[PDB]
Design a protein around this ligand. Sequence first.
Ligand SMILES: CC(C)CCC[C@@H](C)[C@H]1CC[C@H]2[C@@H]3CC=C4C[C@@H](OC(=O)CCC(=O)O)CC[C@]4(C)[C@H]3CC[C@]12C
Ligand SMILES: CC(C)CCC[C@@H](C)[C@H]1CC[C@H]2[C@@H]3CC=C4C[C@@H](OC(=O)CCC(=O)O)CC[C@]4(C)[C@H]3CC[C@]12C
Ligand SMILES: CC(C)CCC[C@@H](C)[C@H]1CC[C@H]2[C@@H]3CC=C4C[C@@H](OC(=O)CCC(=O)O)CC[C@]4(C)[C@H]3CC[C@]12C
Ligand SMILES: [Ca+2]
Ligand SMILES: [Ca+2]
Ligand SMILES: [Zn+2]
Ligand SMILES: [Zn+2]
Ligand SMILES: [Zn+2]
Lengths: 166, 686, 154, 686
Amino acid sequence: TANSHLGPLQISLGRMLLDILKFLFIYCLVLLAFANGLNQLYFYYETRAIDEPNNCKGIRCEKQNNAFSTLFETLQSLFWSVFGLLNLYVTNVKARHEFTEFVGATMFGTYNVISLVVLLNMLIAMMNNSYQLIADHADIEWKFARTKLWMSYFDEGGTLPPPFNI
Amino acid sequence: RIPLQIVRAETELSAEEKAFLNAVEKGDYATVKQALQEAEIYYNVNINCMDPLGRSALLIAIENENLEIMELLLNHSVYVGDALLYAIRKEVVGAVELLLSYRRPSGEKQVPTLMMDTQFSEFTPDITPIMLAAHTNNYEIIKLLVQKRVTIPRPHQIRCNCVECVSSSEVDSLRHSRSRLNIYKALASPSLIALSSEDPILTAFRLGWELKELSKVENEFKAEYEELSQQCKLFAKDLLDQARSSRELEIILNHRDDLAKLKVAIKYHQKEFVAQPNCQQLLATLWYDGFPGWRRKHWVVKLLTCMTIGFLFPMLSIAYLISPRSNLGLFIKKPFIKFICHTASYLTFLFMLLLASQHIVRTDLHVQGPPPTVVEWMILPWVLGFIWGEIKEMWDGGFTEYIHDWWNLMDFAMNSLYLATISLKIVAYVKYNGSRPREEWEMWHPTLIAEALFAISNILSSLRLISLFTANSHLGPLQISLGRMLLDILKFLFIYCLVLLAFANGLNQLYFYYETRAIDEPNNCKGIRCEKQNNAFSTLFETLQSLFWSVFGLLNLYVTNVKARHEFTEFVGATMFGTYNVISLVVLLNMLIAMMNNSYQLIADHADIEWKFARTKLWMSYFDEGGTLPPPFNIIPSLIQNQHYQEVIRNLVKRYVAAMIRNTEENFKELKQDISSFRYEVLDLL
Amino acid sequence: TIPRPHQIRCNCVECVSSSEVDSLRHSRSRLNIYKALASPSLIALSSEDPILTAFRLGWELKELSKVENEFKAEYEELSQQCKLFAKDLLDQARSSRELEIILNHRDDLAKLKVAIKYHQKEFVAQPNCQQLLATLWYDGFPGWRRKHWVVKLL
Amino acid sequence: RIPLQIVRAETELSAEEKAFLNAVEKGDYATVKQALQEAEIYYNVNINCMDPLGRSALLIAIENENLEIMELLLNHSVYVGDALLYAIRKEVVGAVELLLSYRRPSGEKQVPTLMMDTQFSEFTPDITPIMLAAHTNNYEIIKLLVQKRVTIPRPHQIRCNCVECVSSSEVDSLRHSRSRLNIYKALASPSLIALSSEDPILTAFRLGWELKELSKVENEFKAEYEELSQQCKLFAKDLLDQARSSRELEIILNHRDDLAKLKVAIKYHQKEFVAQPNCQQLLATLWYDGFPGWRRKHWVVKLLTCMTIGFLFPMLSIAYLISPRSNLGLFIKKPFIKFICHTASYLTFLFMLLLASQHIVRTDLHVQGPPPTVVEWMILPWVLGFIWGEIKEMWDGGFTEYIHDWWNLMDFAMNSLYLATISLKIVAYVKYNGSRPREEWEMWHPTLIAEALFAISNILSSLRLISLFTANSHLGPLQISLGRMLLDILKFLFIYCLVLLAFANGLNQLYFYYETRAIDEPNNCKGIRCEKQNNAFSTLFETLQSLFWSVFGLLNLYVTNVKARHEFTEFVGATMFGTYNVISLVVLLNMLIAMMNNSYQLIADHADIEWKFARTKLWMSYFDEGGTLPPPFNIIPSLIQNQHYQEVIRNLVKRYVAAMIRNTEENFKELKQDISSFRYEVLDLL
Ligand SMILES: CC(C)CCC[C@@H](C)[C@H]1CC[C@H]2[C@@H]3CC=C4C[C@@H](OC(=O)CCC(=O)O)CC[C@]4(C)[C@H]3CC[C@]12C
Ligand SMILES: CC(C)CCC[C@@H](C)[C@H]1CC[C@H]2[C@@H]3CC=C4C[C@@H](OC(=O)CCC(=O)O)CC[C@]4(C)[C@H]3CC[C@]12C
Ligand SMILES: CC(C)CCC[C@@H](C)[C@H]1CC[C@H]2[C@@H]3CC=C4C[C@@H](OC(=O)CCC(=O)O)CC[C@]4(C)[C@H]3CC[C@]12C
Ligand SMILES: [Ca+2]
Ligand SMILES: [Ca+2]
Ligand SMILES: [Zn+2]
Ligand SMILES: [Zn+2]
Ligand SMILES: [Zn+2]
């Protein structure tokens, strides 16, 4: 708020953060639904850490282990798939159950299509519209925030810095 | 240079006729009276003479609103053809009164014969005075015309196949379309609806629905039909807005041919009528029937009451079963308690579906036909209650109304998935006895198919919670914009499916000779779902899957490499894959972003009205007594009204007419004409 | 005289009885009373402290718009009208002494703190109040806006 | 209930005073004359009495424009204080003439004494009549005031540190700011500039620049200063637009204190003046000096002429060196041929830099200090010519003008890189004799550093071609929008750098205990640039690089895994990395997209004007004779004008005044007043 260029930017950031929260509610609901479906489909094929290479179990290995074995692991794997850090061979099982693998791949593809084609672009559209409304009033609220910050230092309470106030 | 000439012959007006028309334009009464008195004796001036702009003396008198010169030109028996149309379009009450009242008296010897004045008419020949008065929307002229026993032709059905409509359309389609549009414009005026209809609200609703259907049918004239439907809807909302007491509002809403008129408005898609503030207040009062002052409370006590009433789901439904006339059983009949109990039941079903996917209950997975666990035995009554509720919703209300909701498709899909998984489980129990290990099971095992359908049904059950977003005040317009953008996403996905099919066909046709067997490849797997990505363009299905997965970047770049050193084919395939990637990631997705962005801006202004309409549709679903019990418990075994409505509509019509009466170069010309006429009369008298 | 509106969270017998008997008449009467009280002319003529009265009426209208869902728009319009009336009355000053008298009046900058507490962004963001706050902010550094940026950064 | 009372005492007007004010409002001359004649004998009515709204009888006469009642109230010696301000604000020429001319005659015995009328003044006490007339922008009142020997105070410098300005700012800052704003508003009126300045264009340019600098300085009053600068710029463009012949335009542009006034307009950033169509036509005619009818031609012959003149780069510059007075040497002095030759030279330099990176020329890479290849020997004269051209541009024009271009920073960087690579090459030649193989070279070898600087200079030389986009008609506004969005990208990248530094500090503080040596890890490499991604959060620089590369998805997920089984630390680091990814890929990038989207919509309306300004700035850079030779060849060793300008500005001022003269409830009140005054006089006479 002290600078004359970074104030309205963070005011628009504050409005768009509320819009991001309104988006993230629906995203959390969709993520919970798809994580429940993926865990219910894939939790029979859980393997122990000793059988897998390098004695590790999870999506944080060199070779990506069972990603849909638990609800927490399924939630982490569905979270990391938005940024593309989850590979495609996590939906493959040891046995040759082609129908279950195809159904899980369809499930993962539908979640990817939703969270990367509908939801993120809708969030972009919402925060775009919000900015246009925010810009006309951006100055007044920036001046109000700067006035609120300026009068916080007007009083004598808190003259000393944090290293010297004690 | 370029010569210029008058291509089309306009006859020049004589000096006397030009002076007479100029005197009529300036409003000099004495000179016009002298010219009219000299016209009969000497025949010098044709009184019905036109001007360069197509107006006669009578039309010039009408446009300047000189009633004195108007009656003086009428007294000498000038031509009067179509002057009433100009008076009605000018919205002059006195001119319309004079033209109506003077045409009858003192008609002697037919009319004086006149020729070749009748070609030029600004108004179309199909037009009649009552229809043009309806288009003008003036009230007094419409009233004076309706008092003289005037009628309007009835338009036919849109899907009319009689001989006369087809013959008129074939002979002259333009005249038929103009006549139908003029008739519907005359019928859609608020003044004619207020004056010639005993039920203005229902007439406005039916006219708005008919105009919307005509706009859907007639492609050429869509815009004015949409404007007429919007005008009828705004007239209905404005007539509803003129109420002054709660008794008048409840009389209007509860009038029948409980809230019958609100249901009729919802059936005709009158969003402005439903979303009016007083109707919303009445629906809020009916919705919070047993909880007075709900808006007053701080949010912690409201959330605590919601938690204590949602956690009390298994009671208050058996209490209704055992004692519906008791004090405790009567609390479930209120709509808010019904909605909270249904939400608590669905949340309990979702939590039970989460609990079914845990290792505490699931044991002994190496059985071919496994008996259902106790969690499944308890989940089965909820599925049966959902089936009974969906079939009851199919029966009550009709099959023609069950399909218009658009949420029933997911319910039908969920019920089909539950029936399929139950049938697969029972068949696996009955004829797959054994304990074979899962690693050597058949790929087409009904247990695996039943579990896959169960997982898809669990996803649909968890995604069913989006429909409850209308209840909140923040998630309603968000999903309305989501619903519009989903249609825009479908319009995008058509072109994306076409481009994907084209590139998949090209890639499969290029790469299907180099298919390899699973034994030769490492780890005995074949497809894009391996640790090392195998042949991705060997089949049409595999090519479609590989081109689908390349949008999210999960397909690597070495899938376009073959075993042999065919560098040209590899380069051509890499160019093909790169062109598909450039299209689907630089043109199409950004165009989809631009389309849904534009749509949101249009959606936002109307977002509230439609959110209030959706919330009103959700609120009245719980008003009726059909479906009081939850899904786990639903399977357990008079002319004074018309007179008051007429009184209220009478007062509302009077108030709306007063409001609309309360709410350009022609105008200043009146002031020049009034000043000029007063100046000539003062000079003449003095 | 004009009747006094009740509290928004009013639970007396007469308000509840009027709401139950005829909610539309009660809502129309309350909206008409608050529209009458929110006019700038009546505030200028019948209030000894127009700025504080406009601030309180704007805060009450904003809270009523937050409470009453049906009539949100006209209550927001009334709050905006009261805020614009307060800013327009502040804008009519002609000297620095009048501005410091208005800002420092108590029932140091008490009225500015009262405006900030009531969320009067237009009143706080007026140019003369911003100039006075800038002068108080650069108390020991006269002519701070004058300087080239290198000496300011140094 | 609530009692209501008049808090502030307004004295009620008596019956006679109220009747007198009502008679003055209705314009009845006889009743007002009778009341004024009875006022002296009986003293019944205070003629200077006010009303409830703060107007007197004279102000009511001024507002209704009743000149008769105005002079009648003046004849009885009413109070006249500040009435001239109301007349000037009302823009009544006759009222201003009457108030100017009546104040002098018939003043006897001071004025009659009057008290307590003087508190209420709508106009501020600092205001004077000439200043308010300048604010009103009326021409006749300004002319009549200027004829009576009236002056305006001179504003001080913005960076004024004298005693009186500082004392006035300290004593009363609001009065000083209002006085300065009123003075600059008075000086910025087009009528005062046209009437009181011998050079309206230069005065408007200086006033616009001063108003823009004041808007940059004064933060509180930025908007009206920007409006005043826009008004001055539009006045200058409108005065330029009133020309009628090419000789007047060339007289205006070529007037000095060749195109001196165009250079002065460019120096003051008058984009509207430069982008006028007639000045653009004159600049296009001067630009295509030797190619008449360039716009006429089909594009194939234009491209063929461009190719044949761009391929003829090595001739026509040596011809200028050997025979500047010849027919062939004179063709290089035209601006279009100069621009095409410079573009051909830069394209040849870029093509030579492409050819330098081929295996045909580069041989024997295992030499420590390699001699320069023949391609480098030929490229060296181009670098020397670029150095000589940049230093010549530094000398000519001044050091204060060389830094405002903003393209010279890349030229300075390119010259520094070329000097550094030449120095590294010469030092490696002089003291690194040998043929050691490249696999065992020092990491700080000057040959490798020289090649890295050469590659960066080659990138800068290839990216220097963006500046030529102003010449085309399609790539100019695109790069103008790119320039605005680059500033918006910088405003985004500040917050992104802060967030990146915070998350990098947290990740390094969490993960720097688990650093491993390069010998223990596979392949003897350590960092995120291995086949297997090594420790990515071991150092602050490595953490910054890893967090930078995670935005594009090139950083894998197993970098947050440690050797030991510390599951809590790994989960905390994964949560940290996920939170940084969610921020930098869901909030920040989409917010940057929204910001640059909004900016483009604002940029598009003005995109042309600024593109034409940039093209005009590029065109006049080649007009002068300084820098005729290309970079490869530049190192090879009078009062009639003022009278005509005054005549043209005189005709332009007259035409602009005629144009501005050619181009509400007060108005209708005049018509009610004129009708009411005529009605009373007719009734009185009759
Ligand atoms: C860009 C990278 C290196 C991160 C830098 C982090 C910090 C060193 C930055 C982030 C925000 C910066 C602050 C942003 C704004 C201001 C106000 C600025 O003063 C004004 O704007 C003058 C008017 C006034 O505030 O009264 C003085 C510097 C300061 C404190 C900055 C100091 C340096 C800060 C703390
Ligand atoms: C955020 C993560 C943990 C997913 C949460 C999923 C569900 C537990 C959520 C999704 C939608 C929620 C519902 C959204 C809206 C409402 C309406 C709300 O009531 C109102 O808005 C009051 C007005 C009225 O509806 O009459 C009561 C809670 C409820 C049912 C919510 C209950 C909890 C639900 C089902
Ligand atoms: C597209 C790929 C192959 C990169 C090409 C790089 C260069 C060869 C391009 C980039 C910008 C181009 C220039 C952009 C604009 C112009 C102006 C153009 O002339 C006009 O627009 C006529 C009007 C005028 O400038 O007077 C002549 C070609 C030229 C110099 C272009 C020459 C070729 C350039 C240097
Ligand atoms: Ca249903
Ligand atoms: Ca340069
Ligand atoms: Zn028919
Ligand atoms: Zn009360
Ligand atoms: Zn000074």
